[PDB]
């Protein structure tokens, strides 16, 4: 009884450590349960499987940004592209400063395989990125129907180009941090990608 | 017979690919690639010491098709080094869509290959690879610049990083949701977009 609003968050913290150390593919619920100090039944109570745990880690990333995200995906917001700028700067600040964000991103990008003996991992990822895509595409049209935004962006493609650049930059920094002074030059990195979204003719219809 | 060995390196590699693709790199070991290929046992050990070593043989095969256009791009005497960079990326994406082998080895590289302190050598290899790749995009871009094909005050290094990231995330995006990027239909649009960023971003200058 309110036994585990608490153990849920301790099970997720042990999942991160197991996954960060041994990787997702070879970690069993039992490694995690041992690490949390609970039983595999205590885990089954919150999660029906390892894919669900992975999900919980993935989903935990959207929290911090939620507001700037939602803000920028909204007409009434006087200034969409500017919330997208803030959002992006926060995304990079949080990767640099927060060990937790970084670790979960490291697990996501470099320690979580897609194999057909658990395709809910690849499935959940597809769904996550299409979700994120609809988001970027709104933010993109709202900027456009606001003069912030060369009236003929192909949105959908601008959105894909954007996610791609931010995604590959993050994974880049994760591979070689001392080669992307991400914190020091946050603004230049964020702007570079925004300059792509408006200054590039190729992203136009 | 030397020619039999060459035959059996090349079939160790073929089966590693199918092997990593279905079961992933983490839970697949040399033993299992021998049964897959139908091989002899020290054979894979003669050829391939490790697993990191075999993984690296796959990641290495990828560059082969691009050698020519990559070399020209970075040649300080080549008259159209950005044209090389352009057509190189065209061949990269063209081959990605068309060549099943390339697509699978990339899928392995991107989606079936964990970095664990448990090896080190998979991650280490990879850092080197990307640092190497980086080196070349810098020269290339630095050649396009001498020659007034890209903005004169461009930061070559930060531009090379921007470009690598875009091409890497774009490739990964397609492997994940291929029906969301007409990579083969639009190839020139995708190459073009990334290249626009290099020539038009003022944040990439100074
Ligand atoms: O909505 C987001 C958050 C961001 C992100 C979330 C988590 C993470 O680990 C890394 C990046 O990805 C993005 C990438 C973009 O191009 C545009 C965006 O609006 C976003
Ligand atoms: O030389 C290469 C190899 C290429 C590549 C892409 C995908 C892949 O799976 C393997 C290699 O990436 C590049 C990206 C560039 O901007 C410039 C380049 O010169 C290169």
- The answer to whether B161 contacts A175, with C-beta atoms less than 8 Å apart, is no
Given resolution (angstroms): 2.3
CA B10 vs CA B55, B102, B201: distances in Å: 13, 15, 44
Q: How far apart are CA B138 and CA B149, in angstroms?
A: 14
Structure tokens given for A12: 């997720």
Structure tokens given for B5: 């060995």
Q: Report the residue from A125, A169, A188 with minimal CB separation from B176.
A: A125
SS3 A204: strand
Bridge partners of B205, per DSSP, are B154
Q: How far apart are CA A127 and CA A122, in angstroms?
A: 9
Q: How far apart are CA A125 and CA A119, in angstroms?
A: 10
For residue B105, which atom of ligand 2 is closest to its CA? 9
CA distance B24 to chain A (A): 6
CB of A110 closer than 8 Å to CB of A44: no
Structure tokens given for B146: 């001498």
Q: Which of A132, A134, A194 to mutate to test the pocket of ligand 1 (most atoms within 8 A of CB)?
A: A132
Ligand 1 centroid to A83 CA: how many Å?
13
Q: Give the structural domain span for B68.
A: 1-206
CB of A86 closer than 8 Å to CB of A78: no
CATH number of domain containing A33: 1.10.357.10
Q: How many domains does chain A have?
A: 1
Q: How far apart are CA B2 and CA A58, in angstroms?
A: 50
- The answer to whether A171 contacts B167, with C-beta atoms less than 8 Å apart, is no
Q: How far apart are CA B101 and CA B15, in angstroms?
A: 12
CA distance A9 to chain B (A): 24
Nearest to A179, CA basis, from B121, B156, B158: B158
SS3 B34: helix
Ligand 2 centroid to A168 CA: how many Å?
13
CB of A189 closer than 8 Å to CB of B155: no
């Amino acid at each position: 009884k309110e036994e585990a609003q608490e153990t849920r968050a301790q099970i997720i913290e042990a999942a991160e450590r197991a996954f960060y150390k041994r990787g997702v593919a070879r970690t069993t619920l039992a490694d995690i349960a041992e690490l949390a100090g609970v039983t595999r039944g205590a885990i089954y109570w919150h999660f029906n499987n390892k894919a669900e745990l992975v999900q919980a880690l993935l989903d935990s990333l959207h929290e911090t940004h939620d507001h700037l995200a939602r803000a920028s995906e909204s007409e009434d917001e006087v200034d969409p592209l500017g919330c997208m700028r803030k959002l992006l700067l926060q995304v990079f600040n949080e990767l640099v400063l927060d060990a937790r964000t970084r670790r979960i991103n490291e697990i996501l990008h470099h320690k979580c395989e897609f194999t057909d003996d658990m395709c809910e991992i690849r499935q959940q990822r597809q769904s996550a990125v299409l979700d994120c895509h609809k988001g970027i595409t709104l933010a993109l049209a709202n900027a456009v129907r606001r003069g912030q935004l060369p009236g003929e962006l192909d949105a959908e493609r601008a959105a894909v180009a954007m996610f791609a650049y931010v995604d590959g930059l993050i994974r880049r920094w994760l591979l070689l941090p001392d080669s992307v002074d991400l914190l020091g030059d946050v603004e230049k990195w964020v702007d570079t990608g925004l300059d792509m979204l408006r200054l590039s003719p190729a992203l136009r219809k």
